[PDB]
Homo-oligomer: A and B are copies of this chain.
């Protein structure tokens, strides 16, 4: 179930090999949408499955009249969502600037329904999205373990971990605001928070193990563009009070240049400056010597990411580890011919005689909860929590 260069590995050798990669000069993680189903997320298949059932009348119009989506993928549930949203936004903008009243009202309903469907699944908690201290719940038990394991394994004088993700939910921020760790995500300020691309070059020092970096490749729920041509960030409560309540409990969609998720409104020269910078920073990271990368929860359905990853293996000091649950079905389907682009890409990647590539298979042995268990603790890390008792006693004093 574990392959490295064509042959097979066992549990002990794999566990020993993983520990050696965590001590390189540069370490990083790339997570997808499959890493949030353990806390309340939904896979891209379920979003389409629900949208198709809920809004049948628009489905025929999308397939027959405007030629935005085909029929085989709709019947197989293999439809990319963000590309469709970008195309719909482009169509709406063209119709608005051409002054065609008939088509202007046709795309508003489609965009509103799509945004209602995608947003309602991104609230990992639900109605308690507004409240504070959402990192103390049991659902986020493993993100803290991941962050602690990544941070505690760095010697003094070395760099800091870098985390890339393709989600637009607030799981990592909630987890990292409970440990006592600060993450740099490019924004600064409180009363007016703006985007400064040079903030990815700073660090803290003590004048008498605090920080990490977080890159989001698809935006976030708390980012929006106001009347001025600038990008702003707000807290969860303010965003809910401002524009998230109306999306879910109203037929409200007025501004097409407002939201910055997911990968939408890219034709504006002010909004694409964020996606381009994030993608450039991702591309530059894996070009450094003595680098490692762990991939989990990502379905290989993007051309540019695959192109960048495959072209980065020319250097003799780049190592990658891939987790893929449904591996045997891919092999069987590729053997008889056919198969999607993801299956072909991952099968071709597996069959090379390279010692720099490792692929892990299995049904439940490749999930996110199992990826965390492989990373090791240090010997001297304090594990027994003996602080909550004192907090309880203080609260009981009253």
| Chain-B contact segment, one of A231-239, A280-288, A309-317 | A309-317
Q: Which residues of B contact A348 (CB under 8 A)?
A: 393, 396
Interface residue? A394 (CB, 8 A): yes
Closest to A349 in B: B393
Q: How many residues of A contact B (CB 8 A)?
A: 18
Whether B306 contacts A387 by the Cβ 8 Å rule is no
Copies of this chain in its oligomeric complex: 2
> Contacts A303-B398, A398-B303 given: A310-B352 contact, CB under 8 Å?
no
A385 to chain B, nearest CB (A): 12
A72 in the interface (beta carbon within 8 A): no
**A310 B397 Cβ-Cβ under 8 A:** yes
From B313, B387, B393, A310 is in contact (CB under 8 Å) with B393
Q: Is A390 an interface residue (CB 8 A)?
A: yes
Residue of B nearest to A387 (CB): B314
Task: Give Cα distance in the complex from A58 to B10, angstroms.
Answer: 84
A101, CB-defined interface residue at 8 Å: no
Please name 18 pairs of A and B residues whose Cβ atoms are closer than 8 Å in the assembled complex, sorted by A: A303-B397, A303-B398, A306-B397, A307-B394, A307-B397, A310-B390, A310-B393, A310-B394, A310-B397, A311-B390, A311-B394, A313-B390, A314-B387, A314-B390, A345-B397, A348-B393, A348-B396, A352-B389
The 8 closest A-B pairs by CB, nearest first: A311-B394, A310-B394, A313-B390, A307-B397, A314-B390, A314-B387, A310-B393, A303-B398
Interface residues of chain A, those whose CB is within 8 Å of chain B, are: 303, 306-307, 310-311, 313-314, 345, 348, 352, 387, 389-390, 393-394, 396-398
